[PDB]
Amino acid sequence: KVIHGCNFSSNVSSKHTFTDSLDISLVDDSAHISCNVHLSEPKYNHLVGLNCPGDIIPDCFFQVYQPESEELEPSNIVYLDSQINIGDIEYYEDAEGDDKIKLFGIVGSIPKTTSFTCICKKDKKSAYMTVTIDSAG
Amino acid sequence: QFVLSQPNSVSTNLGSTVKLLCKRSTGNIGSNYVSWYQHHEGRSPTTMIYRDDQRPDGVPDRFSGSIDRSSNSALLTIDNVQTEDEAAYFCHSYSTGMYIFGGGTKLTVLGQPKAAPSVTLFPPSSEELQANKATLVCLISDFYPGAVTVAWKADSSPVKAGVETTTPSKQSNNKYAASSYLSLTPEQWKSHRSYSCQVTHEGSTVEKTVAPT
Amino acid sequence: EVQLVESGGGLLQPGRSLKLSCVASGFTFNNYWMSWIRQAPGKGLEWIASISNIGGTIYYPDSVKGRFTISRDSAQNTLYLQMNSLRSEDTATYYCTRDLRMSDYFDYWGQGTMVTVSSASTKGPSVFPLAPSSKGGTAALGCLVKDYFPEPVTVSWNSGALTSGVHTFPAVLQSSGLYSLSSVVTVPSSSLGTQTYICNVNHKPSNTKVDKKVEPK
Ligand SMILES: *[C@@H]1O[C@H](CO)[C@@H](O)[C@H](O)[C@H]1NC(C)=O
């Protein structure tokens, strides 16, 4: 089963397969680039997460980030449980050198459609994973 | 991943301008943010510069951070140098998984005319030798700046063992002091005509000599 | 404001276990990376460990890898650094920092705690007198302090009555672990035959008091 998410590392692995991928090391330091996941199903049974060859901000996916400004530092950090409000969520993690794979599993229908963001940081480079999960599709 | 290199120690005067370098070994200095930290003795370090050129609230306009891509190094510039600036300065940069600190540069603000070291050399005491212990004490006081190198000479040949010296410590009059010691056996102290302590200060040496009583 | 107060530490022996505490306040604790930075005596700053907001990421250098353990408490607002199987090399001033991971710097530092690890047991100092020598017209005389452990050692001249020109030199660290310092006093060279000079060496760690009178030769 595929991971609806973003692979930022240059390590292509069969242990985890991502729908989208963007090599972070090829992104400029001053660029505002994001990789976008949009789920729109009546009921869900999906893996969502990312593979970051650097550092993950915040501690995704137990914490996520909902922004309201083009700020440099988040500090507006919410928790996935309160944001999705689907009850018990299964969280995952795996390593592969500097590669950090963080996942979560969503099963069922969510009350209100919600969006959140996770940041992959490599040196001065920074890419956003923005996911949107629809309520009814 | 890389190593940040700083000069061991520098010195300038009041109201002058000093630039502290932080050379990155491998990679580009601009690929990773650089931060600067001021450290006084017996005190917590304080952040002076963050992401390359940013200065936190409370840090004087004197300090400024810069990135020199030609030399692949970062510079902490301190205009109108004050004596309160005299401390240790560390640069920092982070690669994924490891936090790199430079060696640190001990800044010295030359605040008084240069002073020549007062060198006093004591022989092993009467009571020292009877306990089969021998110790030559070379006290160095009233020298500024606080940086001297000591070289002992059994007979008049170099000594490469038994020498222990303290790092320069600041006196009450803002001058510095240090003390060197030479452990011997009472048979080594009396088999030689003399022993001499050479104190090199600013490239000028002062030497004293004692002989077995 | 943001405050970082460290606790724990002290004097330990190699092979034991220590746990330092760092109580954080003035900010949302679960939203910041925290780190431990140490400074060895006569050495520069060295990074030890970093932990993310909820410990989703932990870093160590190869020096303390497996020996140290960093963790945090969300409710107690406290960061810890468990130390096991220590060494004399780990004797350093351990600092606690709050980090801005997105900017790769430490914006707030703790007040610093001291951890001393050694196996040399307690031993009082052997005090030896230093006969006066010229400086002429001015004579410099003192008394020696040798082979003691640990610091500090306080030296007074004439039970506090002699303060003029008294300069006690900072001690040196011998290889074994023991120490050695010297306390010299400069006096007019005319009073060498009429004054009784006695340095009072005090070593409370071993409860050893030694009074050594200094005479000319
Ligand atoms: C890829 O995998 C290798 C070996 O598993 C690892 O050393 C490396 O850190 C990983 N990430 C990147 C970006 O190469």
Author numbering:
A (entry chain P): 293 to 429
B (entry chain L): 1 to 9, 11 to 27, 27A, 27B, 28 to 66, 66A, 66B, 67 to 106, ...
C (entry chain H): 1 to 52, 52A, 53 to 82, 82A, 82B, 82C, 83 to 100, 100A, ...
Could you give the paper's own sentences about this structure?
Pfs48/45 is a cysteine-rich surface protein that plays a critical role in male gamete fertility. Antibodies against Pfs48/45 have been shown to prevent parasite development and transmission. We also provide molecular details for the development of mAb TB31F, a humanized version of rat mAb 85RF45.1 with improved biophysical properties, now undergoing preclinical development.
To uncover the potent epitope on Pfs48/45 bound by transmission-blocking mAb 85RF45.1, we solved the co-crystal structure of the 85RF45.1 Fab-Pfs48/45 6C complex to 2.7 Å resolution. All six complementarity determining regions (CDRs) are involved in mediating interactions with a conformational epitope on Pfs48/45. The buried surface area of mAb 85RF45.1 on its antigen is extensive (1039 Å2), and primarily contributed by the heavy chain (650 Å2), and less by the light chain (389 Å2). Ten discontinuous residues on Pfs48/45 are contacted by the antibody to form salt bridges or H-bonds, namely G346, D347, D351, Q355, E365, K394, K413, K414, D415, and K416 (insets). The five Pfs48/45 residues predominantly involved in interacting with 85RF45.1 (D347, D351, K413, D415, and K416; all mediating extensive H-bonds/salt bridges and with individual BSA > 75 Å2) are invariant. Pfs48/45 6C contains a mix of parallel and anti-parallel ß-strands that organize in a five-on-four ß sandwich (a, a′, c, e, and f on b, d, g, and h), which is consistent with the (SAG1)-related-sequence (SRS) fold. In fact, NAG303 forms H-bonds with D390 and D391 of the neighboring loop and buries approximately 150 Å2 of surface area on the two loops that connect strands a–a′ and strands e–f. Importantly, the N303 N-linked glycan is distally located from the 85RF45.1 epitope.
